[PDB]
Paper text:
HG3.17 was evolved from HG3, a higher-activity mutant (S265T) of the in silico design HG2 that was engineered post-design to reduce the active-site conformational heterogeneity observed by molecular dynamics analysis of HG25. Over an evolutionary trajectory that yielded the HG3.3b, HG3.7, and HG3.14 intermediates, a total of 17 mutations were introduced into HG3 to produce HG3.17, resulting in a catalytic efficiency increase of approximately three orders of magnitude.
In all enzymes except for HG3.17, the unbound state is never pre-organized for catalysis as both Trp44 and Met237 adopt conformations that would prevent productive binding of 6NT. From HG3.7 to HG3.17, no further changes in catalytic residues occurred during evolution. Yet, catalytic efficiency increased by approximately fivefold.
Author numbering:
A (entry chain B), B (entry chain A): 4 to 303
């Protein structure tokens, strides 16, 4: 059975997966995505270092391929991340003038979002903006522009494509007792009260064995920020225990504003941490017990 | 052991593999390439649709990543294909004016080769130029320019980077009686007699089970064209039988002008025909029997 069909039958929007051109032309990835998943994301083809490697020199061939494939095959598209320190080319980090950096950030956002206007359901606008202690991460945008870079990014994104859901994304939001989880909730509440158009919080979830249970309490906490949506992004789980995966799916089901889940690839050998075998399909493209456990859970 | 070190000890230049950025950051590909292979090729990041998706406007982020990684890790680099019909954006195929298409083709060749001047050992300049019956394939270049497009392409490439070895590449050159094999020999001899700088023939070798034996006769026939070099390119073998792979390696060893072999990826799940398990490593990144058979053949 298709986990995307089953999660839609329980009132959610999608079960999705990250992919890109050379996955779709190799292995069994295209066949599995067509049958079992409802939304694709670019693994890497939309990141800043892939799309604007030097100023004004936009590289769209890879992202175009993915968007086309998804439209032909009737899949939803999510994309990101527009502003994220980790995938930033050096030409951006070396800018020290505030007005320049604001315009460079705006141009990057507007150019990417305009190109795909109306085709992208969800955009990750700002990523990994918090330190582990809950303070704001001192990336180039915070250092040069200040804390208004976040309002500016979201305002710019809303103007570029008013149809898209705009998300802030972070990782290590997997425990309700962790300071970072509480901090992002408090800051998003205050940004939204001031009119910043943040539609969603996306939890980048790279879990160790046994950490699924904690998400049952972390996800409701993220939802308490009052955004229209929350989601689970680029999920994988070391060891791929059915218990961990089922717990994450049940957290999604329990939180009414959680629209769906995106796993971080199809088959284990194509994972960034392949030795931990953390995905739902094995190296022979066979479903693993965690896939069947999700199916069972969604049927009941 | 490393098959690249062992083939070097037998007097050849390399045992290589096709890869690209997202392979180097996932699975065990980087570790295996570092240990076992001596030359990397771009799986897709140098093709025309990836590098010049609109006229005069280039996308080099993916190719730059590969070239940098290879230099950092002491690997040789091969690249291609500059002029192929199968990877051509629609804007090129629509051109109907001979001078315009010549200029477009020359600009494509010169821009890519200049960017990496001196860094690339082998360039595939023209690919898949022949029909199965041995006549020239009627692609946009033949239809608009005529059969001079091949001389022009090679002369332009030689001027752009004199260091590089320049190859023509085709598939189904695997049997010595097949018409395409003799046809490429006939034409390459003619072109070289006219001073066209074709340094090599690359045989793009996608074999079915049992076809390795015929390569022992086909590869020397290709070498009879008199090019300085021949190579085996983008090799895979349905079923990955040790007998097939050993026969291909021995054909390389038997042909003095054959400089090396490149396989079409590391592990079976990342093959374009994964259900035929045609590569040297399995879905858990373990060497397969064919890998060990090549090791022993090269030591004996």
């Amino acid at each position: 059975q298709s986990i995307d069909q089953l999660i839609k039958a329980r009132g959610k929007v999608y079960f999705g997966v990250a992919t890109d051109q050379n996955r779709l032309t190799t292995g069994k990835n295209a066949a599995i995505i067509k049958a079992d998943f409802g939304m694709v994301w670019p693994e890497n083809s939309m990141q800043w270092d892939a799309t604007e490697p030097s100023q004004g020199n936009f590289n769209f061939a890879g992202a175009d391929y993915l968007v086309n494939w998804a439209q032909q095959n009737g899949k939803l598209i999510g994309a990101g991340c527009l502003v994220w320190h980790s995938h930033l080319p050096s030409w951006v980090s070396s800018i020290t003038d505030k007005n320049t950096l604001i315009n460079v950030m705006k141009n990057h956002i507007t150019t990417l979002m305009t190109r795909y206007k109306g085709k992208i359901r969800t955009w990750d606008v700002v990523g990994e903006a918090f330190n582990e202690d809950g303070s704001l991460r001192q990336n180039v945008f915070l250092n040069v522009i200040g804390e208004d870079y976040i309002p500016i990014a979201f305002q710019t994104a809303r103007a570029a494509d008013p149809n898209a859901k705009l998300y802030i994304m972070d990782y290590n939001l997997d425990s309700a007792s962790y300071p970072k989880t509480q901090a992002i909730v408090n800051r998003v509440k205050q940004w939204r009260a001031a009119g910043v158009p943040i539609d969603g919080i996306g939890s980048q979830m790279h879990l160790s064995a046994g950490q699924g249970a904690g998400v049952l309490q972390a996800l409701p906490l993220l939802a308490s920020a009052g955004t229209p949506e929350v989601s689970i992004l680029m999920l994988d789980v070391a060891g791929a225990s059915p218990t961990d995966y089922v717990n994450v799916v049940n957290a999604c089901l329990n939180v009414q504003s959680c629209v769906g889940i995106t796993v971080f690839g199809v088959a284990d050998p194509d994972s960034w941490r392949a030795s931990s075998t953390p995905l739902l399909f094995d190296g022979n493209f066979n479903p693993k017990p965690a896939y069947n456990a999700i199916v069972q859970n969604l049927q009941q």
